[PDB]
């Protein structure tokens, strides 16, 4: 499995990815991913049990969630893998990502409804079923709620942080995990959700297929951080209430720990990942 930058996909790969996503939607399987994400994001709290968000397991949790999704895509078309969106490089509404042959563009100004691409409500192929409001059509407002996507320099500043995470292991933490997640600092991952707008800005953000592309790049950044910091590793490492420690299992799967997900090469590689250097 090689995870490729979306900007590099061939027309054939884009076709095959879109078709496999639409088949997971048609069969009912897609919406259960949406529901799982929403349950965790609504339950993960700074003061209580937290697994998928606002916590050190944010990264291994999304890694395994994306793996389940990619595995479902591969059950439809074994050639498909999750592409990633480098939002530091492909940062305008004119990126090819947002073209009609791939994810479609931004939402119209009246109601935010996406009008083009394979996931436009008008296709009849992308009903929004798992939702927090009556509207059942994909919505986006690219750049509407926040002006700019993170830059490479901003990403670099976060990649340079040596500690994986720090007590109190929540949205108030200093440390790489929380800066990448975005609750503190220049704000990388949360800001991208806000920038896309529409469902991507809500608990049911996997309703937008760009969800997977975003998290696949976040996941790549974790891998880049590890290469930058081969001497640094996941924390905490034992006896932390409400937080998934290194060798603790994670919900909902129960059969996997963060320890099992630190090395992504057991599951896939990237098109390019700089080796450790100085």
């Amino acid at each position: 499995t090689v995870r490729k930058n979306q900007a590099t996909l061939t027309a054939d790969e884009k076709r095959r990815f879109v078709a496999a996503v639409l088949e997971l939607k048609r069969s009912g399987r897609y919406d259960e991913f949406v529901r799982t994400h929403n349950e965790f994001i609504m339950s993960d709290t700074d003061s209580g049990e937290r697994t998928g968000h606002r916590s050190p397991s944010f990264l291994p949790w999304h890694r395994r969630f994306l793996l389940d999704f990619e595995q479902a895509l591969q059950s439809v078309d074994s050639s498909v893998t999750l592409p990633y969106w480098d939002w530091s490089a492909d940062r305008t509404v004119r990126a090819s990502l947002w073209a009609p042959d791939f994810l479609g563009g931004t939402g119209r100004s009246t109601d935010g409804r996406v009008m083009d691409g394979p996931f436009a409500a008008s296709t009849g192929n992308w009903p929004i079923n798992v939702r927090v409001d009556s509207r059942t059509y994909l919505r986006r407002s690219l750049g509407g709620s926040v002006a700019e996507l993170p830059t490479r320099a901003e990403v670099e500043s976060v990649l340079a942080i040596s500690a994986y995470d720090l007590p109190p292991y929540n949205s108030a933490s200093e440390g790489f995990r929380n800066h990448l997640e975005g609750w503190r600092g220049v704000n990388l991952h949360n800001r991208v959700h806000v920038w896309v707008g529409g469902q991507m800005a809500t608990g049911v953000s996997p309703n937008d297929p760009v969800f997977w592309l975003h998290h696949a790049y976040v996941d790549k950044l974790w891998a880049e951080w590890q290469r930058r910091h081969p001497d640094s590793a996941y924390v905490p490492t034992g006896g932390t209430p409400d937080v998934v420690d290194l060798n603790e299992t994670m919900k909902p799967w129960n059969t996997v720990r963060p320890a099992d997900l630190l090395d992504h090469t057991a599951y896939y590689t990237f098109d390019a990942l700089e080796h450790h250097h100085h």
Partner: protein, 73 residues
Amino acid sequence: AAPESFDEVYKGRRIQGRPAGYEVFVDGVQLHVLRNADGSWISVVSHYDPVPTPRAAARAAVDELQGAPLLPF
């Protein structure tokens, strides 16, 4: 400690909040909200964008909804 309750009409919709940790409603339907460690708030319809108070979260929800009813969680 608990924020104060509130009741107002915002952009033609009734928003209410009350300590429970804290509950928010839009036209009588509950809006799930969470308080962050630094005391800011988010809601299920704006989950990655902290705002200072539960009323701000309610108003951000009404802005996002553009008139649509909320679905009961």
